[PDB]
Amino acid sequence: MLKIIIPTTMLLPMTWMSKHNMIWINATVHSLLISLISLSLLNQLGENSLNFSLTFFSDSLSAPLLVLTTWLLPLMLMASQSHLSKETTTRKKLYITMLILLQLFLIMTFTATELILFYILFEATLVPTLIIITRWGNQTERLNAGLYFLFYTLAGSLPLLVALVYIQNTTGSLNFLIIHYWSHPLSNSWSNIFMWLACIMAFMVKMPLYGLHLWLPKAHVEAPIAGSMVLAAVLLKLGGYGMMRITTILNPLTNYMAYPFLMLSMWGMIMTSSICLRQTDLKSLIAYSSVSHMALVIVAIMIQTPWSFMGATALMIAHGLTSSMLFCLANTNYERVHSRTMILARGLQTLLPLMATWWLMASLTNLALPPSINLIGELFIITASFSWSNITIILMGMNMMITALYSLYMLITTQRGKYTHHINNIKASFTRENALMALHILPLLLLTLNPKMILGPLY
């Protein structure tokens, strides 16, 4: 699988040795090239995963993530074109290195064949993002933003490490294939429930879980524009991809003690969606809506119904995209006005009509309107939950109450309505914003026509 790994490793000499003017022209022109190279990984067998080597392998679950990450990397490049034009060239090369290194650690992480190799490359991603969030951030609190990020993720990461080595000494291998074939029932002993607690709370923290979610509002809001998309789009989803992987040996204790988490997600998803409708900062909305959708997929894995694993993958990519346009859009209002208050800028179609067109179709994508894979994945979660419990619908049905209650709400107060006559700052839309808008939303309608590949391994 070094088809994709090495050219990204080499991309660091590429950007570092590139000339003064190109750099970003260089950075994109080859990151797109790597994207179609990673588009090859769409070749799955039925159920036997693509085992490329002893340490690297991929399956129907990992591959959609790989294409998401690799194709994402050009997007923050062009997204960061505006924000970081003033800075000198050397840090420009360093910033791209952080982006490439981040995507580098992502692709190996999703493709590791040994659990600890996944873990070492799991939390290896906070190191570059901590640099991105803290150094290149904009507002003052960004200092405390990074601390909240790493400490939250680490507070659960270390228990996983102690658990992982324990399984190594107990079973003899943490490799996905061996642990899957030699999967054994995790008994109900108090020792084993804490083992389950160790192997789950790590992903739950950066899931996030209701109550264990403060980092995203304190990080995504003050993260740099490029950094903000990457966190929500994919760096949310390491825990998820790990979660469906480690859940092969935690049975049957999962069906017995997932209730507190199924609780905290269900109430949290309504709670997060409701508070999402009542923030004064637009950037907090995509952050709070993100966890609301993200709280949904934790429900999927807990019931571990085949249908639940169906929508877990689809919603992951769907939301992972969905947060991307909104953060891109929410960015576009910011630097134009140097504020993230939706109240300050209202009715932008009277000034930016094309931006509004992109705004609404991303919004209705967040609405989970079929045939978009946002709904079908999200819908499969509903069906699995009903199989788990018929009553489940009402609490989550309350989530199909708040989403559109806010997901069109900023539309009618950011892109829709009248304009304040004092902001002459608002200007025409540079084609970059619409162009990246095109590569952002056009895919989601494209693979909508063909949902089986991003459906997941349960096909």
Partner: protein, 64 residues
Amino acid sequence: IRWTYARSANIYPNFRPTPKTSLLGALFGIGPLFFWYYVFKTDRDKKEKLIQEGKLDQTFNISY
């Protein structure tokens, strides 16, 4: 920007753990959760009381 800082930032620097704040947090935090736990734990086992000695309909339920 006085309002924006107020609505988000000023809360905890001015927050004080009064007894009523704990009660409201209880009946809006752990409280509603236990509501969902008791209702969801019940029907779940109520379903589990159905399957074992065969009193549940599974004529078409082959998409578990």
